[model samples]
Target: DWGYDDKNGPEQWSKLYPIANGNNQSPVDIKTSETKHDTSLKPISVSYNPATAKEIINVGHSFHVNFEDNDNRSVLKGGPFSDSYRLFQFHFHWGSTNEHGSEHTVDGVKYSAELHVAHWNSAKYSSLAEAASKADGLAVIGVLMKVGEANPKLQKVLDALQAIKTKGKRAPFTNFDPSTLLPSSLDFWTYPGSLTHPPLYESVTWIICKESISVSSEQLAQFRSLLSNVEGDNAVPMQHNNRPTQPLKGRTVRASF
Candidate 1:
């Protein structure tokens, strides 16, 4: 029942998930000037098969477009990852308005929203559940979204929101190309981090894009329209689902350019 509310939000997450206060917790503020520009870092490789996209579901927290991750058909490689990670699901985090919503921030500046393309290390683990606990278990690609002209590439996904308005609701979302969601530039900052939400596992290697994509004010409102409540339950708008930035704990962020 962890949610983005005054009573059950990030502040209270530590009570249930002890690792919420761990040293490597995520959604940290990236100070661009302080980041190390690594010359040896390779460009990120994203291979996504539209057929791998299966369904979209409202999981109470946020709507995730789950993919067929039984194989490496859709996977993420290069950058900080020593091995390929299988594409599992992707989701978004947004706020009530456009001012601040993103979980990861650049120079303390918040964006309208953020996108998390989650993948688990298939080379070393059998499944996402198996990899969810190891230090090198997961690699999550984070794309920051700023408020601007509406993103035409995102319209298809947003349009499907109507079918999954409440929690536990799902609908077929096939043949969707998630790569179209990335920004023009692949430059990113890499670091060791944890999941932005509970159980707050310290398993993710965060790869956050430097450049941000556009999301119009109207389009952002569509994200907020999603309900956290399931059918026959009190309706609560899913807004500000993003976790606040955590302490960096002397962790260094490397840049791939």
Candidate 2:
């Protein structure tokens, strides 16, 4: 069994999982002009009602809020694509640099961080791996960040990060509305892709909103403060947790106007 050591980093994880070298791995660089194939892409039908979700706070990966799957109905509300899309754990991806934070890029510009709300298709698949093989089995909502105003909604969560500096710790949170964190505009760019991490399944239907949310530099610093360079080394600075850009391999990215 492998543990959290320097050799076990994500770059080295493929030795254990073997499938890490797949072509479907995510964070693919989007080159829209080269795409020539006809892909029948559909708009995602999502109905998010905050009242139905139960909130749980996980302190392990920095204090963050998680809306656990209370009932399968919420999954169903995600639409015809919903049956295939089961609500999985949610996480945030930030950066040491304020200018580049997003995992996926359009044409080639990186944003100041991105929030990924991950979901898997359960209609025709049994596991996340199985669903990840198809073009319609995954959905990820990407939120961009800009440095300026302090995000009030994020303050409470950032403050809680101090308590869970180490891994595997957790706190409790309730009655949080995820929609409140979203920007006013719903304009977005949609595409087909895979997960940014290992097992890089190419089953994702990506919805990246055009509107960006603002967060102060201090808030960004707090996120940087919570991370560690390697296992058991607290003093080392944590920088660059993002995956490198992948080749687009000729895919079309659709935008909702």
Candidate 3:
């Protein structure tokens, strides 16, 4: 299976999926100095409906909170996007320690964790599945998380983690709004990148926030309790389940304040 092992690691992923080594792969080291501030970039707006959060799924790598995208109930618009995008799902990547867990590093700096809210181009693509494979089809907001006081809003999501302790497990999750998970500042860096996983399609327009959210160490430890597989089948820990930063490959990183 696809994993972060010595044999099946990111370094060897190019063998199975050629795009793993593509020119615009995701989770890049966000070189702040190298980024260009674009005046044309608009402020981002997030409109998430608490009633639309459907279920929580443990897809092995991460626990995803799936959202309904039939209409414009939950979406991210503006900021380097020509059209509003629908929310598909949201997941996270973290490590065992408070340091070196984030996928996208800002000027070689790694945070404790990273949260990704996946979105698909509602105007261009008919569905999320169709959009995940094409260029300009998908967009994701990456929020960096630092070790701080536990977030009450985040606790609601974490509280539901007990039902899905192992991989392939899922439980009903509702009345949840993802906007509360965001930091105050929407200032972000945008670029084109991939999904950072198997079938790593280079279809994502990454919008990584410059500001970060806060999560207590205890809250982070609860995430570590999740198992990659049930019954201890010699599987690796879900901790540090993030892809390493990919090369920029001359792809320009745009910024909006």
Candidate 4:
């Protein structure tokens, strides 16, 4: 049932969800060697309290926490070089096969999956699109996925996935801090580029962590079991939803060792 048929494929997703055609898309390829090295782009201290974050019911896609407006404000603040940004949304990108599931690749190696923690620079403006124009408008934390040990932390989000099965459905998720999903090490690869999604905003600051989180085959299978096709329609299963890598375009990529 999870084959890459036309209606069930990511290429045809725009028809089901108009937002898929938006200029600001995701799942971009991260070519690190081509990028310039800059040491000044470092993230400031961040602290998030999921228990106090403002929980919003599903208005459109899924449940989300407002980092800027809620108790998670301290942890979601922007870097020292830029004004505090707000946490907008979070999503995942996975592969059809376990070999290459991640959006960003390092040294030509791709992980089984990846998690994108998206935040926009609030200092520039209220709209994420506006912030996408400035150098300091965005920050994304890329978490790599490896095929191995089980990921207990992911249970919180995975459990809620069924509750918001419909495209526009949403639910309340409290005490869900993303940090819990991250590995202990903070070492990361940093760079300045545009959003991987449509409009491909070139104002993003990306942080791709070197370490990967482990997930069991069972967990990976569970994720793959979800219905990727349109509602009420029996279509092929959703296989790969990730965007292909983009050109570095003479950009520089940095790392925090």
- Arranged by TM-score, best first: 1, 3, 4, 2
Q: What is the lDDT of residue 228 in candidate 4?
A: 46
Tally clashing residue pairs in candidate 3. Answer: 0
**Model 2 regions lying over 4 Å from their true place:** 1-21, 31-45, 51-64, 73-84, 125-135, 229-237
Of the candidates numbered 1 and 2, which has the greater lDDT value? 1
Extract clashing residue pairs from model 2: 29-246, 59-170, 84-121, 84-122, 85-120, 85-121, 86-120, 101-111, 101-112, 101-113
Root-mean-square deviation of candidate 2: 4.2
Candidate 1 lDDT, tens digit per residue, 1-257?
Answer: 68889888999998889899899999999998899999888899999999999999999878999999998899999997779999999999997789999999999999999999999999999999999999999999999999999899998899999999999999999998799999988999999999899889999999999999999999999989889888888888887699999999999999986
lDDT (Cα, 0-100) at 249 in candidate 4: 47
User: What lDDT score belongs to each candidate, Candidate 1 first?
Assistant: 0.92, 0.61, 0.87, 0.62
Q: Per-residue alpha-carbon lDDT of model 4 for 1-257, expressed as tens digits? A: 11235554446555655544543345445565554555665554456556544443332212344443432353354232456656666667677788877888777787887887777776667677677667678887788889898899889777776765533445666766777777787667776665654445556777777788898777776666555444576733445555666545454566665
The best candidate by lDDT is: 1
Maximum-TM-score candidate: 1
Tell me the lDDT of candidate 1: 0.92
lDDT of 3 by residue, 116-213 (tens): 99899989879988888999999899999988898777888899998887888899999988888999999999999999889899999999999999
Model 1 error, position 237 (Å): 1.2
Comparing 1 with 2 on TM-score, the higher-scoring candidate is: 1
Q: In terms of TM-score, which candidate is stronger, 1 or 3?
A: 1
Write model 2 residue lDDT over 37-77, tens digit each, in one string.
Answer: 32343444554555444433433333345655534433422
